[PDB]
Amino acid sequence: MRAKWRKKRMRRLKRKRRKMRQRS
Amino acid sequence: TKKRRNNGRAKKGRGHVQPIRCTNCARCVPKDKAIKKFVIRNIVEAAAVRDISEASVFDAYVLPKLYVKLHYCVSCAIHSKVVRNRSREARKDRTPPPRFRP
Amino acid sequence: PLAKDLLHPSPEEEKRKHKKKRLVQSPNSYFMDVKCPGCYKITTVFSHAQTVVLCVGCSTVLCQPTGGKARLTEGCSFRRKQH
Amino acid sequence: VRMNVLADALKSINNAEKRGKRQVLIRPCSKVIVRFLTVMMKHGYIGEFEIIDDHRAGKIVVNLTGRLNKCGVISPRFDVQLKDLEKWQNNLLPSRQFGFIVLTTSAGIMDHEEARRKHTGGKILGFFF
Amino acid sequence: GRMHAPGKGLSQSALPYRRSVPTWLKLTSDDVKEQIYKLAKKGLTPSQIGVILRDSHGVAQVRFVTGNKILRILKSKGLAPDLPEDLYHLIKKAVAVRKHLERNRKDKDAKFRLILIESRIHRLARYYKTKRVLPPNWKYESSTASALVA
Amino acid sequence: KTTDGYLLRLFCVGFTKKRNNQIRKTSYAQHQQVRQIRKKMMEIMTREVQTNDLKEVVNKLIPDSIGKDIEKACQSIYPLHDVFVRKVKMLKKPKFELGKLMELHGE
Amino acid sequence: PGRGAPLAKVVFRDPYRFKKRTELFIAAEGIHTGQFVYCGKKAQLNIGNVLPVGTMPEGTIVCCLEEKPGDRGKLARASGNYATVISHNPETKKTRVKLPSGSKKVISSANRAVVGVVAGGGRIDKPILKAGRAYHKYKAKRNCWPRVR
Amino acid sequence: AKRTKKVGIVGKYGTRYGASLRKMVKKIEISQHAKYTCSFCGKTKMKRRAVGIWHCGSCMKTVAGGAWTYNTTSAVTVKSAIRRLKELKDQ
Amino acid sequence: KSLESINSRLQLVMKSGKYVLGYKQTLKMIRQGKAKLVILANNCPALRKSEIEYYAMLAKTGVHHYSGNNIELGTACGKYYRVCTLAIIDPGDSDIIR
RNA sequence: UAAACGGCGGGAGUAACUAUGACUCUCUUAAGGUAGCCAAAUGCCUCGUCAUCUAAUUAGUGACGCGCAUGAAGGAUGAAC
RNA sequence: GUGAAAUUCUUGGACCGGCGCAAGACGGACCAGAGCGAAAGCAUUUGCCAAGAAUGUUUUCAUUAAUCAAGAACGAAAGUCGGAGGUUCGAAGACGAUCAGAUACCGUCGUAGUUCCGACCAUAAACGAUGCCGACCGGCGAUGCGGCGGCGUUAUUCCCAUGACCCGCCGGGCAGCUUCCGGGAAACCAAAGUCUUUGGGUUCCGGGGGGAGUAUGGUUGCAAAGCUGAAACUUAAAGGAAUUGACGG
Ligand SMILES: [Mg+2]
Ligand SMILES: [Mg+2]
Ligand SMILES: [Mg+2]
Ligand SMILES: [Mg+2]
Ligand SMILES: [Mg+2]
Ligand SMILES: [Mg+2]
Ligand SMILES: [Mg+2]
Ligand SMILES: [Mg+2]
Ligand SMILES: [Mg+2]
Ligand SMILES: [Mg+2]
Ligand SMILES: [Mg+2]
Ligand SMILES: [Mg+2]
Ligand SMILES: [Mg+2]
Ligand SMILES: [Mg+2]
Ligand SMILES: [Mg+2]
Ligand SMILES: [Zn+2]
Ligand SMILES: [Zn+2]
């Protein structure tokens, strides 16, 4: 991938991870 | 590799140069980077100068000129062939092409 | 020129060089005797004076401060002090 | 700012020697510089040098004889004992047949051979060969 | 280079090698001292006193002609300013910038210059407290500094 | 404003002129020189309109004598060559007196 | 009580008999006690003066505008509000103004108004935060507050 | 010592009304209860009496001002504009 | 230049000349006839300003209307309090021309 | 013009074990339910399936989601009460 | 309007031409390998307010300095919050085309935004992919500012001053050309030189490629996110500069 889009994908994944952890 | 010493633009002691829009595609180009052509063309064609002179109500009427400054991004400049790619040694000169007066 | 004589530079380049970059520092300024017309006394004025020098016997200005050198008022005479 | 007057002077001499100039001008003078140049002149690596005396720190004009290779400096003036002078000597000198190390000692500024001759250590100043 | 600017200017004064008094100077040491006293009573700082003396009365160096510096002469007579000249001018500049800034809140350039000026003030005050020119408890307060200058 | 109540907006332009023996490519005026030239050519467009009627304003901007005297006056700051009153526009008109219109046309 | 705009008690002299006339002007912001205000055609442009709109310039703004030439002030009375004098025409004696709602209104040039903005500032900026504060707000106005859907 | 980290004057509201609403009302309450320098007597005794009314304790001068601040930026720009239009109107 | 010049001249009147700060003392000095210059802040009450101007007209002394206020005039005097009216007995520094 | 009332789809085939279906075909709508959330006070089937809690749980919690018939001026959260 | 179209607007006068009005943006050409600023950045006129480099100085103080963990100010654009304003452009969204498909490139419309005020955020290929201070080491022609000296031309005036040119010198800048100074893997660099002939002072920072700027902890933020920041495991190369060939819608 383009590095910028890998960065965007990682940011989306990190928001999802934060939401999952906050739910606990 | 660094292709050009000036990085393809005239910005030397500046931080920021305001952008302009390419006359062909309306791309935002830094003003010092864009290719500028100042065209000064007869407002009538050289084929029609005689017809306009004959149809003129005046005798010594000087035909008006048309003064247009055109800005190009390098993409449109290369596609329109105003500029061309050059050899590694030939890139270094800045002398404009001759006007070919004769 | 690999063999320039740094010890003994001629006065031409000694003068063209910057005041600090000379072999020995020498100011480019001097002191001048100034004569105001219609007055008898002589005023000692710095060549690069930053203030308006005035005569005490006449309400007249002798020099006007500029960027580099005090511009003497017209009609005033001046000579150097000991070169 | 300039913090090592001797280092600046030695670098200037080295650059002028490399460029092949006949005379070099070193602007900030000092007693340490004069003693270093006197050591070099007594060993013959430089010619006569003349001190232009202004009321500030003077300047020095040195006549270069063209037989100097390097006149570097050791900027942190390390304490040099006679037990490690040999290690300094074979670290800094091109060979054991020539080359000198100038170190400031209690007896004065002088080369390592005289320092060993009169049996004293001191602080490292520089080297030349 | 400059302390707080990226400038490397060289404009200075080249004092001549001849420390002797010129023969055409008829002013004596006491005469120059009296002129300095009159100018100091008029309120001129030592820099201005030197400028006036050099421009008008033809004296090249007060130290060369009298043997003492202008601030030394003023302090000996007992009329030297309470604050040093340069510190006073730095505080004056800081007060002016703060007065401009309290009306122009968007002048971030002025805020940056104010930070530079106050840093210079604190460094100079540290130097003067080290030299015991200033009291050991002397502190520059932005609120109360306005009454010290102008 | 003219004497008869016509308000005019005048736009004047000038261009710095290079000398015949000039070798330097550019002929740029400094900012203070430009400001002085602008002030001069504003104050010698005011006084040629304030103290006279629209008729003798028009007849003297017909040959653009205003621009000619502007160019003459500005030579002591920086030479100018192409000095004209580039534009003038009417802003307000005074009530349209038919007698004034008829004396403008006839006698 | 009931309005956010402060009121200004202003005392005039009766021109026809020996008496003092007390008015209850709406306070334009910036006026203070002990200040002289001037009301009439020849009054100058200052905050608190009352003068006809036709005598005012093309960009001035006004506080207590008359809807009709001769009644008292009717427009831009609520706190922080103002009207703007846009345009005039000396013939037909009409003045176009902009109201606080943004609408454009043509009124007579003889309508008077107070120069400036009415005091009371941005009263609606502060959140009420409390049903009790709303209760106290509307108790001074009328029986409208607790609103059932 | 410092008693609150960030709430300051709106610590009286406790946990109620929402953090953003408390933050919004904080600066308004600070300006409401602040004492301003009187421009008539020079003392810092000009404080709000009611909404839009600002009274000075010393010179007993009452001024019509803003709801929460002594003067509003709107009114300041208005005063400057009226001064400019007056000086343009007269000559 | 006028404001900074008058501020510097006031600073030099302080510490080098005799002055007096305040309304009551200013009036007392004026009616003693030894006040040579009276400085009034623009913050001054209009009645007080008019009365001091009348006193100065009677005493043939000058009045300068400082372009500050009482706070800024106190700062110019170098004090940490507001001064609204002040008088100079003798300048000592050519603020008052002989 | 939806912070108006309101509404927000089907049928087939398809990946080198199976199983799903990223993908592809069509029919159709005014648009085909998005972000979220869930056997929820909203899920018939149903005491759903898995885990946890118990010796044993049609209860509770966590998770899953083709959800009979969840869903955005109301959705989802979040202290204090 | 486009490659061609179509969505769209149009006998209700669309487009076009003329005269006006209103609004909000934007300051073309002049405009440059020109200037200023710590960077970000800065271009209509005029006024006000403070600030500043360079220059000139035979002024003053006399080492007051350089770089700097922690800390602090500013910090494009996008984004967030509150209030105004909203002309144009235009994320999202809708539609028309293109296509095998076309959630796009092209076209029409259009929300947030783009504008101003106040408060956050602290990130950019925030670049010279190049720390700051100091010294030395080639030539040349220009350019900007300041100063100095000179044949002359020009502006008025009666002459010098003072401007505009011309010829030089000095200092501080933006740079450029050239060179077997020298360096470098080379491209190239008068600095990226004065480095095995290795030491002027000082700050930050890298240690094969991935995992990974990820997990977790802490901290900042309204949020988006920012700062600090692993390991398991995996891999024999990944990369840089140049050469030849092949290929290029
Ligand atoms: Mg490439
Ligand atoms: Mg940039
Ligand atoms: Mg209700
Ligand atoms: Mg809709
Ligand atoms: Mg769903
Ligand atoms: Mg469910
Ligand atoms: Mg249930
Ligand atoms: Mg139970
Ligand atoms: Mg459950
Ligand atoms: Mg799930
Ligand atoms: Mg921004
Ligand atoms: Mg907003
Ligand atoms: Mg559009
Ligand atoms: Mg260092
Ligand atoms: Mg690694
Ligand atoms: Zn283009
Ligand atoms: Zn008061």
Side-chain angles (χ1 to χ4, degrees):
Chain A
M1 292 176 70
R2 192 177 166 179
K4 164 188 283 215
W5 308 142
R6 289 186 291 114
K7 185 163 170 169
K8 190 182 203 83
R9 169 186 284 188
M10 185 63 73
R11 283 205 168 108
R12 293 178 181 176
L13 179 58
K14 271 152 59 65
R15 291 183 292 174
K16 183 175 174 65
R17 287 211 203 103
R18 291 203 308 269
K19 184 175 175 66
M20 292 298 291
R21 272 198 81 195
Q22 154 75 30
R23 184 175 178 179
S24 310
Chain B
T1 79
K2 198 167 161 201
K3 194 163 175 169
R4 304 176 179 82
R5 174 172 177 114
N6 74 333
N7 298 120
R9 58 195 305 192
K11 191 181 68 81
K12 270 310 162 183
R14 293 91 180 96
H16 185 246
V17 183
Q18 69 264 21
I20 57 180
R21 320 293 309 262
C22 170
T23 56
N24 203 323
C25 71
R27 182 181 179 89
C28 274
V29 189
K31 186 186 164 171
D32 64 296
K33 193 164 194 274
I35 294 91
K36 305 170 193 89
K37 178 190 282 187
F38 195 38
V39 63
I40 309 301
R41 189 177 66 245
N42 270 331
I43 207 164
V44 304
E45 274 265 0
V49 288
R50 184 177 179 180
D51 304 351
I52 300 299
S53 296
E54 293 293 328
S56 180
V57 301
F58 297 102
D59 45 349
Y61 181 76
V62 164
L63 290 168
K65 293 283 184 67
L66 183 62
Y67 309 81
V68 167
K69 189 174 179 181
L70 297 162
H71 315 99
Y72 295 104
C73 60
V74 305
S75 296
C76 291
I78 288 164
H79 181 77
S80 287
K81 304 192 199 313
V82 56
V83 303
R84 273 194 54 213
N85 70 343
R86 301 193 280 182
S87 80
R88 196 195 282 109
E89 293 83 3
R91 286 192 265 253
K92 291 179 71 65
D93 62 357
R94 316 183 97 231
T95 289
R99 303 292 312 189
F100 318 122
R101 62 184 68 87
Chain C
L2 310 175
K4 186 183 287 185
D5 179 330
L6 309 196
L7 278 170
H8 314 111
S10 57
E12 293 83 3
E13 69 273 17
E14 183 66 26
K15 291 186 286 185
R16 75 179 66 251
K17 280 197 270 154
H18 188 264
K19 46 150 68 169
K20 290 293 188 165
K21 309 207 206 180
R22 292 191 178 105
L23 211 63
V24 191
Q25 296 178 358
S26 296
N28 276 323
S29 61
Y30 47 85
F31 290 104
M32 63 182 73
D33 283 328
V34 189
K35 296 181 178 66
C36 181
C39 281
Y40 69 101
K41 64 182 181 293
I42 305 300
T43 309
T44 301
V45 175
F46 193 45
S47 52
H48 294 234
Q50 301 156 209
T51 48
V52 173
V53 184
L54 284 148
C55 294
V56 298
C58 182
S59 164
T60 185
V61 298
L62 295 187
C63 77
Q64 291 272 12
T66 72
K69 281 191 176 181
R71 185 177 64 246
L72 295 174
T73 51
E74 279 291 28
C76 295
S77 178
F78 76 110
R79 67 172 63 90
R80 276 297 273 270
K81 291 289 181 68
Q82 66 166 358
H83 287 284
Chain D
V1 293
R2 176 193 295 106
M3 294 179 184
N4 211 316
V5 170
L6 180 68
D8 274 30
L10 284 183
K11 186 72 81 188
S12 296
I13 297 171
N14 193 74
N15 293 359
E17 179 65 26
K18 278 199 282 224
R19 280 293 284 172
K21 307 293 196 293
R22 296 293 300 274
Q23 289 187 346
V24 63
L25 187 137
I26 42 175
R27 179 174 62 245
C29 171
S30 56
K31 297 180 295 182
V32 172
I33 289 182
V34 173
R35 296 285 184 182
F36 205 112
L37 289 175
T38 309
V39 170
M40 294 177 71
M41 191 203 59
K42 291 299 292 294
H43 284 320
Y45 286 60
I46 58 156
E48 293 180 354
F49 61 100
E50 185 174 0
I51 293 148
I52 296 91
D53 189 359
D54 52 5
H55 289 333
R56 276 77 62 192
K59 303 169 193 262
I60 298 180
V61 163
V62 185
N63 295 335
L64 305 174
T65 59
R67 58 186 71 181
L68 185 60
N69 305 268
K70 183 91 195 284
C71 54
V73 75
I74 308 291
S75 178
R77 281 149 188 235
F78 290 114
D79 293 329
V80 182
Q81 286 170 274
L82 280 161
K83 62 185 288 294
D84 66 33
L85 184 55
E86 181 66 27
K87 297 158 164 104
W88 277 102
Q89 185 176 2
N90 64 7
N91 271 358
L92 296 182
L93 293 194
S95 81
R96 295 183 67 189
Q97 322 295 141
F98 68 103
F100 292 93
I101 295 170
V102 175
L103 73 164
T104 183
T105 63
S106 174
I109 283 172
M110 63 185 179
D111 59 356
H112 69 261
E113 300 182 336
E114 185 178 1
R116 191 179 267 108
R117 263 203 311 277
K118 63 177 65 174
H119 196 58
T120 185
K123 274 150 198 305
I124 195 54
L125 276 184
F127 60 95
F128 67 97
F129 51 86
Chain E
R2 304 274 78 73
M3 177 169 295
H4 287 161
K8 299 176 184 175
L10 201 64
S11 67
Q12 294 179 357
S13 307
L15 197 66
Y17 184 83
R18 303 257 292 282
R19 289 172 180 169
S20 47
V21 172
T23 62
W24 47 262
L25 201 67
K26 304 305 118 176
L27 294 174
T28 61
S29 184
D30 60 356
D31 292 331
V32 191
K33 282 177 186 289
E34 293 294 328
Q35 293 298 109
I36 303 155
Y37 296 153
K38 289 167 65 176
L39 294 156
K41 296 297 247 168
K42 289 188 188 297
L44 299 196
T45 80
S47 304
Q48 320 171 294
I49 303 188
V51 164
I52 298 298
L53 274 184
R54 168 206 71 192
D55 281 27
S56 296
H57 308 91
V59 61
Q61 281 295 303
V62 177
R63 172 167 54 93
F64 284 173
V65 65
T66 79
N68 290 318
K69 321 180 84 205
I70 292 191
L71 189 63
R72 296 265 178 82
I73 291 159
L74 289 194
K75 184 177 184 292
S76 175
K77 184 53 68 175
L79 75 171
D82 58 356
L83 282 180
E85 181 180 1
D86 57 357
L87 189 69
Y88 169 91
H89 281 103
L90 278 169
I91 294 157
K92 181 168 199 313
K93 195 175 294 277
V95 168
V97 173
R98 287 210 176 256
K99 189 212 186 157
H100 164 85
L101 206 50
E102 60 87 19
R103 291 183 292 112
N104 303 81
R105 299 292 179 90
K106 272 172 76 90
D107 215 330
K108 301 168 188 173
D109 193 345
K111 180 191 281 187
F112 182 81
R113 303 298 152 183
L114 182 60
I115 295 170
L116 295 193
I117 295 168
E118 293 190 320
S119 293
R120 270 201 300 280
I121 287 176
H122 289 116
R123 287 165 69 160
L124 197 53
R126 201 182 47 221
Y127 163 72
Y128 279 133
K129 286 187 283 186
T130 298
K131 298 287 97 175
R132 294 184 300 275
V133 172
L134 283 189
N137 59 5
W138 193 95
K139 185 48 76 150
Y140 161 78
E141 294 86 4
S142 302
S143 53
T144 62
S146 184
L148 293 190
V149 292
Chain F
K1 180 72 70 67
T2 59
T3 51
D4 51 357
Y6 287 99
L7 189 61
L8 309 167
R9 199 164 265 152
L10 281 73
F11 303 89
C12 171
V13 292
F15 299 83
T16 58
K17 177 179 64 64
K18 68 175 311 160
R19 296 291 185 183
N20 60 5
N21 74 321
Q22 180 172 304
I23 303 293
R24 192 177 311 147
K25 167 156 75 85
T26 71
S27 303
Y28 289 144
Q30 274 161 354
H31 186 64
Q32 283 322 293
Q33 293 176 353
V34 167
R35 277 175 46 95
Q36 292 179 356
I37 284 172
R38 220 199 311 273
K39 187 195 140 191
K40 179 87 61 194
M41 82 194 198
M42 291 176 70
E43 62 89 19
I44 64 173
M45 291 188 288
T46 54
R47 64 178 172 84
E48 290 79 1
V49 180
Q50 292 179 356
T51 46
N52 57 4
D53 194 86
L54 185 66
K55 180 170 72 175
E56 68 271 16
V57 160
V58 168
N59 73 359
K60 71 186 290 183
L61 70 93
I62 276 164
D64 213 339
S65 62
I66 300 170
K68 292 189 286 185
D69 64 68
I70 283 178
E71 155 164 353
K72 181 179 74 174
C74 293
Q75 302 300 87
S76 46
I77 301 157
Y78 207 107
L80 279 72
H81 60 294
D82 278 334
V83 185
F84 299 96
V85 176
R86 175 187 72 86
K87 193 171 173 164
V88 66
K89 34 169 65 167
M90 188 66 71
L91 299 169
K92 290 175 71 175
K93 303 155 78 78
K95 184 67 174 66
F96 163 72
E97 293 294 328
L98 185 60
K100 276 73 176 175
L101 179 59
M102 293 300 291
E103 63 88 20
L104 289 158
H105 285 282
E107 283 96 17
Chain G
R3 81 170 78 232
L7 296 197
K9 188 165 296 166
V10 183
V11 166
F12 287 86
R13 264 180 62 224
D14 202 279
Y16 308 111
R17 59 185 59 83
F18 187 63
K19 201 186 288 186
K20 288 286 208 233
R21 299 299 195 185
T22 293
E23 321 281 340
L24 203 53
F25 286 6
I26 292 176
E29 183 175 0
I31 73 165
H32 58 88
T33 56
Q35 185 199 351
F36 295 131
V37 287
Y38 300 80
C39 297
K41 164 151 89 77
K42 306 294 194 53
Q44 311 169 3
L45 291 173
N46 289 99
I47 307 300
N49 290 8
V50 187
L51 72 163
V53 290
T55 54
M56 285 189 250
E58 307 280 352
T60 186
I61 64 169
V62 289
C63 179
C64 200
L65 186 48
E66 297 180 349
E67 190 151 34
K68 286 288 161 50
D71 67 349
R72 332 287 201 90
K74 301 278 161 162
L75 319 170
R77 292 164 56 89
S79 70
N81 282 113
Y82 58 92
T84 309
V85 171
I86 300 160
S87 79
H88 298 286
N89 54 333
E91 68 274 16
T92 67
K93 293 181 181 180
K94 287 308 168 166
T95 295
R96 195 136 164 279
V97 299
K98 184 178 179 180
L99 295 172
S101 48
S103 70
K104 304 293 180 68
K105 215 185 169 160
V106 181
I107 53 165
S108 296
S109 277
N111 294 33
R112 299 167 300 147
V114 185
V115 182
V117 295
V118 57
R123 179 181 28 95
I124 60 165
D125 298 356
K126 196 203 207 191
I128 287 167
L129 286 188
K130 282 173 58 184
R133 300 243 181 107
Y135 161 84
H136 291 301
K137 159 181 200 61
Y138 290 104
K139 177 147 169 99
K141 290 164 164 292
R142 68 205 70 78
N143 182 212
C144 65
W145 166 59
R147 188 176 180 88
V148 172
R149 285 167 298 114
Chain H
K2 182 182 278 187
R3 298 181 293 244
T4 53
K5 179 179 173 187
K6 61 178 55 169
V7 296
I9 202 182
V10 297
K12 56 167 164 183
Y13 292 133
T15 66
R16 304 174 289 270
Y17 319 126
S20 72
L21 287 186
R22 294 198 314 270
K23 180 174 181 288
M24 186 180 289
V25 71
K26 169 166 178 183
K27 65 178 72 66
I28 281 163
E29 280 211 341
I30 286 180
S31 78
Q32 181 180 1
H33 298 124
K35 280 165 204 57
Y36 296 79
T37 296
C38 178
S39 78
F40 305 93
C41 73
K43 304 203 183 62
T44 318
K45 308 209 200 178
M46 171 76 68
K47 53 167 298 190
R48 212 192 74 160
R49 164 178 288 167
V51 61
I53 294 144
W54 295 82
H55 179 83
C56 184
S58 287
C59 54
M60 308 273 307
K61 195 83 66 176
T62 308
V63 193
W68 328 109
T69 72
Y70 170 68
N71 45 56
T72 46
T73 61
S74 197
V76 171
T77 60
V78 171
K79 184 178 173 65
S80 300
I82 298 299
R83 172 177 48 56
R84 207 169 333 279
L85 272 70
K86 173 164 173 270
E87 67 183 1
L88 188 151
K89 183 189 196 181
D90 65 356
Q91 275 152 28
Chain I
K1 185 183 186 275
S2 80
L3 166 78
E4 61 97 13
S5 179
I6 192 66
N7 273 354
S8 75
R9 292 185 276 208
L10 209 45
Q11 183 179 3
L12 186 59
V13 172
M14 320 284 103
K15 173 261 298 179
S16 175
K18 295 180 177 67
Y19 54 95
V20 70
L21 296 195
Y23 169 50
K24 290 173 67 176
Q25 287 180 286
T26 304
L27 281 192
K28 185 178 184 293
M29 281 312 111
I30 287 170
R31 63 174 68 121
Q32 273 157 270
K34 64 180 73 174
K36 294 181 176 66
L37 183 62
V38 169
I39 296 179
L40 296 167
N42 62 37
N43 210 23
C44 194
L47 176 55
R48 181 174 293 170
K49 190 170 299 172
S50 199
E51 158 196 40
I52 295 169
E53 283 181 59
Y54 200 90
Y55 266 79
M57 185 262 307
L58 286 175
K60 293 182 183 293
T61 194
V63 160
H64 173 81
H65 297 259
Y66 186 72
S67 64
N69 76 333
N70 50 348
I71 304 161
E72 294 180 355
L73 190 52
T75 307
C77 294
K79 316 300 201 174
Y80 299 99
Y81 45 86
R82 303 166 303 267
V83 58
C84 180
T85 309
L86 65 90
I88 296 92
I89 315 301
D90 57 321
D93 65 50
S94 77
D95 195 359
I96 299 167
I97 316 176
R98 279 84 59 196

